[PDB]
Design a protein around this ligand. Structure first.
Ligand SMILES: NC(=O)C1=CN([C@@H]2O[C@H](COP(=O)(O)OP(=O)(O)OC[C@H]3O[C@@H](n4cnc5c(N)ncnc54)[C@H](O)[C@@H]3O)[C@@H](O)[C@H]2O)C=CC1
Ligand SMILES: Cc1cc2nc3c(=O)[nH]c(=O)nc-3n(C[C@H](O)[C@H](O)[C@H](O)COP(=O)(O)O)c2cc1C
Ligand code: SF4
Ligand code: FES
Lengths: 433, 217, 62
């Protein structure tokens, strides 16, 4: 029967990332026997239109955090050639606090990523794939290079790439410690040998991207699932999760949980089931839970009142006023300082701003100072509303979406934990007068 | 708090434009290989790796290294200065042989990262910005390293050491001092991103190739 | 101090159009020099040109 209602119990027969835990050969031979690099020539020979259609039918949404529909976004490069080469860029930066999915995909299933690069480049008509990986992921990048080497030797990429007739290259470029370089345009700038400063849009990368050429930026998770969706088909991938929330998803459950880990799960699984089944629940019981950040630091946190009934997909968490983000659940129990955690996140954002645009460069540092004073209680209640307005000024007025990610956790803390702030201010005034 | 590092350069007898720096011939072969990846006429794109390569041979980046990279790639030196001061992995000052980077962001802090930081400080006798007098270690704090599930974690010269405890961090320091190298990864009998006990999923044998393939392919 | 003997050294008149200024000067009997208004020419701006694939316009910094 269609339109399921209780998502969140899928067996290992339907998991794309079968070597998530690295319990199986991470090299090619392993991948080959696990289903990787299968019927690639057939998929390539089906053409870009067929490949684009499969992505579209699946309903695949961008796993990098924004959730833009993947098929429509990849169809933006279906234009005829204009003399410029076309490129696919894989975003392997993984800078979001709480997020470790791309690291595991790269280190334990690199051939999935390489095949995803090949199929995505064929769909876009791209000439080569640049994989921008985090600089701190030295061993992951080296495993990726070993995988690309054994794919080149076996003729799975390079000239003709198959019995296919299509030439495709895969390059790995390492960053040097910059979270802002996860942004697609800032990533493009960092590939071209500049500071990782985001561009303004328009133009979008499909018009003017890397080296000024048409480019498509795709998250590692989005790229990896691309070949499994093609062989399995769009209809199969969709058969999971609610409407407009199709497919499976990697979740990183960390913080105050008994067994922090990462796990593949159906999209619309309830948060409570995910936390209590895979992560072993909250230390101190479920009633010890204080707050949850469902999608990495860039998303507003939610209190226990919402966490017990919210689904883990895009629209459900949007209705909870937070957002799915990178599907990186950070759990905080009743034993933590909720203001201190948000202050640390704001300090991270202050240290990660590129400084290009005025609202981010000035207001995030301003919010950091205000939040550090809030932690002690130095402030007055009239500043809390003031702080709210500061965030509003920052949000939607910056080039880059780092300003949004800095302003949203503060808004969440003020929306849900204002009384704690006020009582901290009252206490500081009481013992200071 | 504040960065602490200055973003101007003042010449010193140990760091001036005449400080001796040059790539090894092997590093020149690697530079040629790095340059080839990018499209012709876009040679600058190699500023990020080649600069890193310099730091991998010298240990840090003297101003002469930046000048050499700028001259090799025919990029104006101020562009290389911009790249060097923007990215935090570039060392514009000498560091110890072992660069200890402990994560203190919120997911990593929630699992008692301060215990690790204090344990390192009391084991080495130095603070969160200083270098040990033997010039072997340098301790700093860093933002999220992407190993949050394994928090508390530390990064040392390209090796992650995760699921740390005060006793665990100290032993790694002991092993690094006595002239040995410690094995990277979790230090709690986990060796993965798996749940700490039970392996809630991925227990079935992996499916064979072509198992779920759709008709007409 | 700065001394002057010119009574018109400070006088500035504002007019809507050059024709009004010319008419005023003519009816007051002053020899005049007129200069045509100089406007900045319309310039073709393009942000994307900063990242040209093969053009010289590409920015070396940002
Ligand atoms: N995976 C990680 O480690 C991190 C993820 N994030 C997430 O990144 C999200 C914000 O990223 P943004 O790119 O700013 O969101 P966005 O909605 O502006 O765009 C996301 C993707 O959709 C494309 N796109 C959007 N509109 C388009 C159009 N009209 N035409 C063509 N392409 C279009 C963009 O080019 C981009 O590739 C955040 O929600 C955050 O959660 C943030 C930090 C780290
Ligand atoms: C500050 C910032 C950092 C980001 N970091 C990453 C990242 O590390 N990895 C990633 O896949 N996306 C990151 N993104 C979102 C990218 O825009 C996204 O990857 C891109 O739009 C394509 O992702 P998709 O495949 O999910 O559509 C970041 C966005 C911002 C604003
Ligand atoms: S919002 Fe912040 S990170 Fe993004 S471009 Fe502006 S200053 Fe840079
Ligand atoms: S917060 Fe420590 S590795 Fe992510």
């Amino acid at each position: 029967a269609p339109k399921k209602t209780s998502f969140g119990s899928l067996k290992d027969e339907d998991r794309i990332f079968t070597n998530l835990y690295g319990r199986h050969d991470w090299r090619l031979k392993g991948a080959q026997s696990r289903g990787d690099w299968y019927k690639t020539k057939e998929i390539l020979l089906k053409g870009p239109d067929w490949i684009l259609g499969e992505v579209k039918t699946s309903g695949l949404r961008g796993r990098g955090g924004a959730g833009f529909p993947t098929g429509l976004k990849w169809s933006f490069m279906n234009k005829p050639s204009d003399g410029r080469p076309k490129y696919l860029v894989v975003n392997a930066d993984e800078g979001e606090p709480g997020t470790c999915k791309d690291r595991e995909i790269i280190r334990h299933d690199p051939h999935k990523l390489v095949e995803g690069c090949l199929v995505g480049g064929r769909a876009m008509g791209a000439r080569a794939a640049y994989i921008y990986i985090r600089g701190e992921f030295y061993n992951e990048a080296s495993n990726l290079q070993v995988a690309i080497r054994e794919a080149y030797e076996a003729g799975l990429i390079g000239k003709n790439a198959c019995g296919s007739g299509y030439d495709f290259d895969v390059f790995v470029v390492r960053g040097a410690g910059a979270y802002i370089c996860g942004e697609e345009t800032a990533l493009i700038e960092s590939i071209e040998g500049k500071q990782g400063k985001p561009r303004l849009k328009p133009p979008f990368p499909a018009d003017v991207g890397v080296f000024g050429c048409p480019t498509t930026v795709a998250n590692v998770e989005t790229v990896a699932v691309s070949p499994t969706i093609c062989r399995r088909g769009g209809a199969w991938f969709a058969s999971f999760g609610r409407e407009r929330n199709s497919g499976t998803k990697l979740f990183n459950i960390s913080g105050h949980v008994n067994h922090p880990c990462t796990v593949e799960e159906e999209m619309s699984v309830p948060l409570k089931e995910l936390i209590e089944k895979h992560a072993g629940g909250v230390i101190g019981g479920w009633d010890n839970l204080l707050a949850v950040i469902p999608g990495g630091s860039s998303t507003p946190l939610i209190p226990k009142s919402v966490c017990e009934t919210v689904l883990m997909d895009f629209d459900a968490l949007v209705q909870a006023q937070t957002g799915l983000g990178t599907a990186a659940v950070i759990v905080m129990d009743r034993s933590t300082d909720i203001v201190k955690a948000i202050a640390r996140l704001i300090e991270f954002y202050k240290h990660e701003s590129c400084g290009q645009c005025t609202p981010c460069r000035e207001g995030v540092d301003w919010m950091n100072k205000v939040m550090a004073r809030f932690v002690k209680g130095d402030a007055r209640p009239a500043e809390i509303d003031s702080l709210w307005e500061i965030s509003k000024q920052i949000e939607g007025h910056t080039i880059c979406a780092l300003g949004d990610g800095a302003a949203w956790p503060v808004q969440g803390l003020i929306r849900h934990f204002r009384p704690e702030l006020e009582e901290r201010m009252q206490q500081f005034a009481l013992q200071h007068q | 708090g504040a960065g602490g590092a200055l973003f101007v350069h003042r010449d010193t007898p140990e760091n001036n434009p005449d400080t001796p720096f040059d790539f090894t011939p092997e590093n020149y072969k690697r530079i040629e290989a790095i340059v080839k990846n990018y499209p012709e006429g876009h040679k600058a794109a190699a500023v990020l790796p080649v600069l890193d390569l310099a730091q991998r041979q010298n240990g840090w980046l003297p101003i002469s290294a930046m000048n050499k990279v700028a001259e090799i790639l025919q990029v104006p030196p101020m562009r290389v200065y911009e790249v060097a001061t923007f990215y935090t992995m570039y060392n514009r000052k000498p560091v110890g042989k072992y660069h200890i980077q402990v994560c203190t962001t919120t997911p990593c802090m929630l699992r008692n990262s301060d215990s690790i930081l204090e344990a390192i400080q009391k084991k080495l006798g130095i603070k969160v910005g200083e270098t040990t007098p033997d010039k072997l270690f340098t301790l700093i704090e860093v933002e999220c390293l992407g190993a949050c599930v394994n928090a508390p974690m530390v990064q040392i010269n390209d090796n992650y050491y995760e699921d740390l405890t005060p006793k665990d961090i100290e032993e790694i320091i002991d092993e690094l001092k006595a002239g040995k190298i410690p094995k990277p990864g979790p230090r709690s009998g986990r060796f993965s991103c798996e749940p700490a006990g039970g392996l809630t999923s991925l227990t079935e044998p992996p499916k064979g190739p072509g198992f779920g393939v759709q008709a007409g392919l | 101090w700065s001394s002057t003997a010119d009574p018109l050294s400070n006088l500035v008149l504002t007019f809507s159009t050059k024709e009004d200024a010319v008419a005023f000067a003519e009816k007051n009997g002053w020899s005049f020099d007129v200069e045509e208004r100089k406007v900045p020419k319309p310039k073709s701006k393009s942000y994307g040109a900063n990242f040209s694939w093969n053009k010289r316009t590409r920015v070396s910094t940002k």
